[model samples]
Target: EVKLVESGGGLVKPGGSLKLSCAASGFTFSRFGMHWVRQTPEKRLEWVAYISSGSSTIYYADTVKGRFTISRDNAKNTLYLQMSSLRSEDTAIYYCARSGGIERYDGTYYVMDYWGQGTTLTVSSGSDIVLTQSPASLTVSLGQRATISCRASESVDYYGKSFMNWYQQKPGQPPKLLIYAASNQGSGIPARFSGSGSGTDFTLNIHPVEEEDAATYYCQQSKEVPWTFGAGTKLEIKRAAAKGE
Candidate 1:
């Protein structure tokens, strides 16, 4: 269990320097990386910056490229975000996220799996999150459990306030919540719709498939600011596998 605590909002006026810190606890801070995300009054989620594990590498969003600085102090187990020449528009809720990286043959990919609740940054007085799925489609017989996967571009860890959600959307109709925050289902949500998974990978299981269960299923991130969504998996019913062709 790792937690990131914000230092709170800064009182610097426009064009002044602003800085914030997120104190971390309960895990090997070096095992995972950290990132900064923000939500503006305009209702848009933005990726602000990121610092790799060990505080050796850093990347800032092009929007805040030069002005934003991200660093970490391994001894104190804390991460910091500093900005200069701030504007009123910069005021928003900032979050420090715990991310994991996969070093593949080609390159490394980072995923945001966990996050801090949030740090309110009010420069003056102001305030898509996506899950991606694999095997875009699935076909199962009755009583069979279909395992579908949802992968986030960044870590969507269960620690902290971050979690994955599942949804079912019928053709020509709005999507309804199937599973909330991974496993918890809401009223009227069927028991067959269950979810389990953590970090960048998540699984949604639909057991004892029924005709009515045929629909497009989606995986979404629980937090806001750059709201995330999985591409969606289309579940179709297949009575049985055909005999020898």
Candidate 2:
């Protein structure tokens, strides 16, 4: 049961500075690294920075270099992202995610396995694309099919491609990538999870849902600026009642 709570994003004047916070719980915060990712108003996703566990090292993307900083307070189990000399283009939804690694023969591959709720930043400027997810929650028995839908305010298709992606976020855990580019499954994702649709309507289907599939699902689009994410759909498992009272 790991959880991450993010805060501290808001309107800021040009050339001002902004600092965001992420409080982690249900796990040892010092044991895993953290990453800061942002989606611009034009719907482009950017990886900003990463701070290694134990507060040992930090890495930054070329776009944010010299202006972004990442740090943590191990005793408080919190992480921080600070930006300086902000501009209107810096306005976006910033997310802090937990990083995990897998070792292979070649090397270790790190992935952002958990994410915060995200904080919105407005640089005194700013459509505002909006995403709507339906069936706020669902309860189903094992081996049943589950469907979640996401509708956008306008067409999200660009150059014949729908930039829709799906994620699964279990309780106290970060969202995991499931489907990308509308219907393509993520690496190592199970076949049971599939996505379909284009333009303003899209669906994510999970066939023969497993017990572990009880989690929240979210849909995000990058087809337009101000990339938006659905409110999220929660899936629960149905358990049999007691024989008699």
Worst 10 residues of 2 by lDDT: 102-111
How well does candidate 2 score on lDDT at residue 3?
84
Model 2 pairs in collision: 2-172, 41-225, 41-226, 42-225, 42-226, 43-225, 114-174, 115-174
TM-score of 1: 0.52
Give the Å error, residue 133, model 1. Answer: 15
Q: Alpha-carbon error at 73 in model 1, in Å?
A: 0.3
Q: Give per-residue CA lDDT, model 1, range 20-83, as digits (tens).
A: 8889899889778787877565434466887777667776666687888888888888888888
Q: Candidate 2, residue 148: CA error in Å?
A: 18
lDDT tens digits, residue span 148-192, model 2: 998888887876767788888664444678887788767789999
